[PDB]
Amino acid sequence: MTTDDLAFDQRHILHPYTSMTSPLPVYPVVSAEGCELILSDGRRLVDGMSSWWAAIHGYNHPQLNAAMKSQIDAMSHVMFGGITHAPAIELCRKLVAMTPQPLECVFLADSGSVAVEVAMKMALQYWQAKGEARQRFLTFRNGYHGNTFGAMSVCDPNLFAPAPQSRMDGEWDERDMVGFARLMAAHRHEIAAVIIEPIVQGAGGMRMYHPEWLKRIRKICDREGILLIADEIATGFGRTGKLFACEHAEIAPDILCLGKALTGGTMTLSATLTTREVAETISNCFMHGPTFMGNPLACAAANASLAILESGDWQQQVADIEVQLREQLAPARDAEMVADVRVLGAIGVVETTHPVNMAALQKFFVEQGVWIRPFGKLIYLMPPYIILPQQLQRLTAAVNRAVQDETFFC
């Protein structure tokens, strides 16, 4: 990559959440292996982000590589309309078996937002088939479910209950419920579904709430006849310490959305699983179909990623990561720029009192030989499960150092 290459990027290529008139530096990566990103100039960086949740087995993993290459030798893509193939079947089997008993019907899609839209369309068609006037969704404030038109309608600015005040680390307080009870009482009759991110509210605040909330929501839904949609696009596949974050409340949703880590972070794929009751009611078809539904290559990558998780090794890896993050992020509770430190599984969050200075903190991080990407008042880690203790220690040392003074804040 030349500097002329980098100039073209600034002038012509839009990047996520960022100006075309004031783009900040972007770093050129040429390759990646294990837990390291390799920059154009040869510098190797320990990845603390898993490229946004997804790369749980890291990069250039031999099992993912082999599977993707083999699939390419067979066929990279073929349409799913009237057709089926081994990768899609092998994947859907693993998905049905690893999720709660009632979730046995699979709608594969391309992106998470699209998987959420499918979930919403599923809830709307469901009630319409019963002849009921239910077009409204009840969600939490601070929630995040995607970029698209429908996904945006249930995002922190339908009906919005307050964000869950009670914590995963701490105690349950009953006052938390008053707002969601008030909303449901007033609206039980027009509500099609409650859509929520279980335990961890990712993009909306990296909040971790007490599992009693999920227990409570599940019973209220059962009682009123209302559908529950669990958005696990960020939480699935072992990130919070359990395979799926719902397991934390011992509950099953009516509709489950998955993505990000599904393919081991090699390429995009998503899935929306539901119950037979929902799947059959709607057909009495579900009106949906992305062009690349069931992509064999993305399914093959996903199958190999799940096979690595079938060993169970991730449980110990994630538990170890949890203990190391708690121990090593704790000192930050004492720095002047930190407001809160919270860990669950392989998620380590240091919330600050003032917002960060993106360009400056990013450079500091790259200088430390680590890749860490902050947003707002949050400096967080979500590393790959195969990260070595030495590598994890480099990440926490860098975070602890960043919050030592106001050099990198505002």
Footprint (CB under 8 A) of a second copy, residues 106-135: 106-108, 110-114, 117, 120-121
Report yes or no: 275 and 104 within 8 Å, Cβ to Cβ: yes
Residue with structure tokens 């880690």? 381
208 - beta bridge partners?
Answer: 200
- Out of 96, 279, 293, 308, point to the residue binding Na ion (CB under 5 A): 96
Given Na ion, a second copy, none, residue 311, with its beta carbon under 5 to 8 Å by kind, binds: none
Annotated catalytic residue within 47, 126, 242, 260: 260
Catalytic: 27? Answer: no
Given a second copy, Na ion, none, residue 174, with its beta carbon under 5 to 8 Å by kind, binds: none
Three-class secondary structure of residue 50 per DSSP: coil
Residue 98 Cα distances to 101, 263, 290, 397, angstroms: 9, 15, 25, 36
Given a second copy, Na ion, none, residue 99, with its beta carbon under 5 to 8 Å by kind, binds: Na ion
Q: Is 113 annotated as a binding residue?
A: yes
Residue 259's nearest CA partner among 124, 151, 126 is 151
Q: Is 62 annotated as a binding residue?
A: no
Annotated catalytic residue within 110, 176, 231, 254: 231
Report yes or no: 213 and 166 within 8 Å, Cβ to Cβ: yes
Which is nearer to Na ion, 12 or 175 (by Cβ)? 12
Catalytic: 340? Answer: no
Distance CA 264, CA 304 (A): 8
Annotated catalytic residue within 59, 126, 144, 209: 144
Report yes or no: 98 and 106 within 8 Å, Cβ to Cβ: no
Catalytic: 17? Answer: yes
Closest separation in Å from C-beta 102 to Na ion: 7
Catalytic: 260? Answer: yes
Which is nearer to a second copy, 137 or 213 (by Cβ)? 137
Query: How far does Cα 283 stand from its chain's mean position?
Result: 29
Output the CA torsion sign for 302, 370, 197, 288.
Answer: negative
Determine if 321 is a binding residue for a second copy (CB under 8 A): no
Footprint (CB under 8 A) of a second copy, residues 48-87: 49, 51-55, 59-60, 64-65, 68-69, 72-86
256 - beta bridge partners?
Answer: 230, 273
Given a second copy, Na ion, none, residue 153, with its beta carbon under 5 to 8 Å by kind, binds: a second copy
Report yes or no: 100 and 218 within 8 Å, Cβ to Cβ: no
In one-letter notation, the amino acid at residue 235 is T
Determine if 99 is a binding residue for Na ion (CB under 5 A): yes
Three-class secondary structure of residue 299 per DSSP: helix
Task: Name the residues annotated as catalytic.
Answer: 17, 144, 231, 260
Q: Which residues are part of a known binding site for substrate?
A: 52, 144, 260, 289, 373
Binding-site members are 52, 112-113, 144, 231, 260, 289-291, 373
Extract the annotated binding site for pyridoxal 5'-phosphate: 112-113, 231, 290-291
